[PDB]
Write a protein that binds this ligand. Structure first.
Ligand SMILES: CCCSc1nc(N[C@@H]2C[C@H]2c2ccc(F)c(F)c2)c2nnn([C@@H]3C[C@H](OCCO)[C@@H](O)[C@H]3O)c2n1
Lengths: 210, 228
């Protein structure tokens, strides 16, 4: 196994360094290449031939090798560099490929962001199939942690609630969604339903009525 | 220029999968083709490689007896078949094309080959749970979804298995303000997700909005009209 540090962090504009630790049979005797994987994207070639760069790759990314150990370096660390980075080798003798564990790059000092909340009531077409779903969509929040509580009128509803884990968006902000499953009867029985989203001690609440 | 992979699928434990890798806007020529897998939330794992021009292949020790790596010269399609599938074989299967032209290769000189071009990946889900197409419901814009100015409208993609589901709007012409949210997994074992689009409030009576929901494991496409 080729070892990489699991996490690496620095503020915007400074230098970060990703290590790739191996042995003589893997990194030692062969060429190391570097790969970038943004969340939800396929990996992308950053560095080939220990230090060379393909067309389109900015000069802020550089590579180095010293025996059994290789290193990727990022200078002028931007917001758009927040990704997963892998070192990869080809064992020429054995004809086998090997990737390091991967390193997550987190950019420090990102500003706090209040969540944007949209709540949708059941569609009449969904109600006609004798089922109801309330859709609470949460986006553009930072840090990536929210608490969701649902209410029927003003009473707490715990049953029939499914919330996702927060997910990272393309703008380095986070998103999550919560769903409240009801019967058309329960939906009509109450005068309103609320989705309450708490983040950094402050709550953003949305309401829907039949 | 691109590597077009076969669609996502559920596969029963003990069964075998064959993932296709079709080159579009370019042919295999004398470049290498590699299969790399990624289990959800995990690292990249090299499985095997082939130089289609030679028919010469190799596979990782951990896959040697279960992987069959092949390639068709003309057409330019490469295949990876993995047998005795297990729950731990659930992963996104990528195919990638090397930068080096092996016509110029001298075996006494290792080449500076690297994974230059990648496919989008096909998520193979190994499960004994059977496939289910989604139920798509419109999420109508109202005064409770309006912010000026702009207005949020969407689609609800309910009860599907397995992942993934892709959503585009207006056949790909509407890309600005589109936010497709990651799916929730219900206790039923079925997933649901939502796709929203933030549009100008003034165009709600004049512009047609259709979300295009793709569920490749069930070969379903729902083009759902979102009206006010
Ligand atoms: C038999 C396997 C053919 S595929 C192949 N690929 C080579 N380079 C791989 C792309 C680069 C790579 C980099 C980083 C990674 F993480 C990764 F997974 C892959 C490659 N380089 N040399 N060779 C020779 C050719 C020869 O096979 C042909 C005759 O049998 C064999 O000696 C390989 O070691 C490569 N083959």
């Amino acid at each position: 196994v080729v070892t990489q540090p699991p996490s690496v962090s620095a503020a915007p504009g400074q230098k970060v360094t990703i290590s790739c630790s191996g042995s003589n049979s893997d990194i030692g005797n062969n060429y190391v290449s570097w790969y970038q994987q943004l969340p939800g994207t396929a990996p992308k070639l950053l560095i080939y031939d220990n230090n060379k760069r393909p067309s389109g790759i900015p000069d802020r990314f550089s590579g180095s090798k010293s025996g059994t150990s290789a290193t990727l370096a990022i200078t002028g660390l931007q917001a758009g560099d927040e990704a997963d980075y892998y070192c990869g080798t080809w064992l020429y003798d054995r004809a086998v490929g090997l990737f390091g564990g991967g390193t997550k790059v987190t950019v420090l000092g990102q500003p706090k962001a209040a969540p944007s909340v949209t709540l949708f009531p059941p569609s009449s077409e969904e109600l006609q199939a004798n089922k109801a779903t309330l859709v609470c969509l949460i986006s553009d929040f930072y840090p990536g942690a929210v608490t969701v509580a649902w209410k029927a009128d003003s009473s707490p509803v715990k049953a029939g609630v499914e919330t996702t884990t927060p997910s990272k968006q393309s703008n380095n902000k986070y998103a999550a969604s919560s769903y409240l499953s009801l019967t058309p009867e329960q939906w009509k029985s109450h005068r309103s339903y609320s989705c309450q989203v708490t983040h950094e001690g402050s709550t953003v609440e949305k309401t829907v009525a039949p | 220029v691109q590597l077009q992979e076969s669609g996502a699928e559920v596969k029963k434990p003990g069964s075998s999968v064959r993932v296709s890798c079709k080159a579009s806007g370019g042919t295999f020529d004398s470049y290498s083709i590699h299969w790399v897998r990624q289990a959800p939330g995990q690292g990249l794992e090299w499985m095997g490689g082939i130089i289609p021009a030679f028919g010469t292949l190799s596979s990782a020790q951990d896959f040697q007896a279960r992987v069959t790596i092949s390639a068709d010269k003309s057409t330019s399609t490469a295949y990876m078949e993995l047998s005795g599938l297990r729950s731990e074989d659930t992963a996104v299967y990528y195919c990638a094309r090397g930068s080096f032209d092996y016509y110029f290769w001298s075996a006494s000189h290792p080449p500076n080959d690297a994974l230059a071009i990648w496919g989008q990946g096909t998520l193979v889900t190994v499960s004994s749970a059977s496939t289910k197409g989604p139920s798509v419901f419109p999420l109508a814009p109202s005064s409770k979804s309006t912010s000026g100015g702009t207005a949020a409208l969407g689609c609800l993609v309910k009860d599907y298995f397995p992942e993934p589901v892709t959503v585009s709007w207006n056949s790909g012409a509407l890309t600005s303000g589109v936010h497709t949210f990651p799916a929730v997994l219900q206790s039923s074992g079925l997933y649901s997700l939502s796709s929203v689009v933030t549009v100008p409030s003034s165009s709600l009576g004049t512009q047609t909005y259709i979300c295009n929901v793709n569920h490749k494991p069930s070969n379903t496409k729902v083009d759902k009209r979102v009206e006010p």
